[PDB]
């Protein structure tokens, strides 16, 4: 029954700037009789374990790098990044261990940068695939920001609707921007019943919209 | 030194049990208790519980009790998490974490899915017509999760690997893919290299204009 909760939810900072995390607990983990704070933070990046950051509130771990700090007391705690960098894109949490474990709900934290035209490419399906009868056809945005971006499909110039599935990568933790993927999947049938295969693209990075179209073969 | 290694992968049907492991190594296993911990697919951190890894005692937070043992093997450093009639919901990562400092498992993913193992089919999208994009489409796979490089992992600039999108047919799907100069095509070689390791399927294709 100690409740964790953080604020805000996520967060979009930008490069060299101060990030700040807020955690508040519903009772005290301030123990009276040592005085510690049994609190910790932790940084949590895709595929990997939480890793360590702070405990007993402020104790930075080993090796973590001086910009990170931890502050506050009794039900109230802020984790501190300076001066943000580009490899600090990751979830956080904060955790009480004076009496059983609870995690906070998180905290995504993005970075915020310039505008970024994304670069529109397509692709037609492979022969290989068409050979077992169906098609793929891949558009791709590389390297825009920010994540809003709009992908429409147009077959013959008539309007798609409810046979393309998008995905986005991660922020890049080397340049801060996303990608996205985005398939049209067709039997092989319809495929052949059309000739010029068209992805249209919507941004801020863009005065007007821009087209990549190729025809089937 | 301290090390909390786990048990692999494993895909299961609802009703079945399963039986995660963790082997500590590097310290004196019966002198800090061990916890569990559950993250499901793109959500939070929660805490499952905690073994005395002296007298063996297991304490259960509230929202896991009934289908879950945990357990341990002294002999080995080992703990181990006993779920019993999987349902798709405990479809998530299982961690393990070690009371005092910063010691945690890779963790376990443990799918729930009556669906079978299935390997991909890899198809380039080749480069045509500065900057040349190329990739690979990595199609009709399950379950999660697929791994992709670029030349035995020569070329890691400049990739950029997708999210699975899980397809209506209850088959997942995700493409990789990787900018170059377009002068490079003719001259230098490019090939994706993929690793689905539930169903073995391994596979360096190549893509050319």
């Known amino acids: 029954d100690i409740v964790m909760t953080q604020s805000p939810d996520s967060l979009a900072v930008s490069l060299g700037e101060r990030a700040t995390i807020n955690c508040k607990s519903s009772?005290?983990?301030?123990?009276?009789?040592?005085?510690?704070?049994?609190l910790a933070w932790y940084q949590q990046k895709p595929g990997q374990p939480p890793k360590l950051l702070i405990y007993?509130?402020?104790t930075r771990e080993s090796g973590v790098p001086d910009r990170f700090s931890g502050s506050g007391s009794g039900t109230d705690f802020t984790l501190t990044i300076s001066s943000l960098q580009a490899e600090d894109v990751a979830v956080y949490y904060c955790?009480?261990?004076?009496?059983?474990?609870?995690f906070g709900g998180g905290t995504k934290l993005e970075i915020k940068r310039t505008v970024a035209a994304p670069s529109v490419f397509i692709f037609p399906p492979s022969d290989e695939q068409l050979k077992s009868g169906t098609a793929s056809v891949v558009c791709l945005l590389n390297n825009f920001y920010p994540r809003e971006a709009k992908v429409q499909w147009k077959v013959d110039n008539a309007l798609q609707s409810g046979n393309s599935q998008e995905s986005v990568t991660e922020q890049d933790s080397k340049d801060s921007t996303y990608s996205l993927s985005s398939t049209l999947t067709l039997s092989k049938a319809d495929y052949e019943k059309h000739k010029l295969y068209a992805c249209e693209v919507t941004h801020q990075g863009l005065s007007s919209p821009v087209t990549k179209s190729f025809n089937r073969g | 030194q301290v090390q909390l290694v786990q048990s692999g992968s494993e895909l299961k049907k609802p009703g079945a049990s399963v039986k995660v492991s963790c082997k500590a190594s590097?310290?004196?296993?019966?002198?800090?208790?061990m916890n569990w911990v559950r993250q499901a697919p793109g959500q939070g951190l929660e805490w499952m519980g905690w073994?005395?890894?002296?007298?063996?005692?297991?304490i259960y937070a509230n929202d896991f009790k009934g289908r879950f043992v945990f357990s341990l093997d002294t002999s080995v450093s080992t703990a181990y998490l006993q779920i019993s009639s999987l349902k798709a919901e405990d479809t998530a990562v299982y961690y393990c974490?070690?009371?005092?400092?910063?010691?945690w498992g890779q963790g376990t993913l443990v799918t729930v899915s009556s669906a079978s193992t299935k390997g991909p089919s890899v198809f380039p999208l080749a480069p045509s017509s500065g900057t040349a994009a190329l990739g690979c489409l990595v199609k009709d796979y399950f379950p999660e999760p697929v791994t992709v490089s670029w030349n035995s992992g020569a070329l890691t600039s400049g990739v950029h690997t997708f999210p699975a999108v899980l397809q209506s047919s209850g088959l997942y799907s995700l493409s990789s893919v990787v900018t170059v100069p377009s002068s490079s095509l003719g001259t230098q070689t490019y090939i994706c290299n993929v690793n689905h390791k539930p169903s073995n399927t391994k596979v360096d294709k190549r893509v050319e204009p």
């Open positions: 974490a070690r009371d005092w400092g910063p010691y």
């Open positions: 590097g310290y004196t296993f019966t002198n800090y208790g």
């Open positions: 073994i005395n890894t002296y007298t063996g005692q297991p």
């Open positions: 009772q005290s983990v301030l123990y009276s009789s040592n005085q510690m704070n049994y």
């Open positions: 007993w509130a402020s």
């Open positions: 955790l009480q261990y004076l009496s059983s474990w609870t």
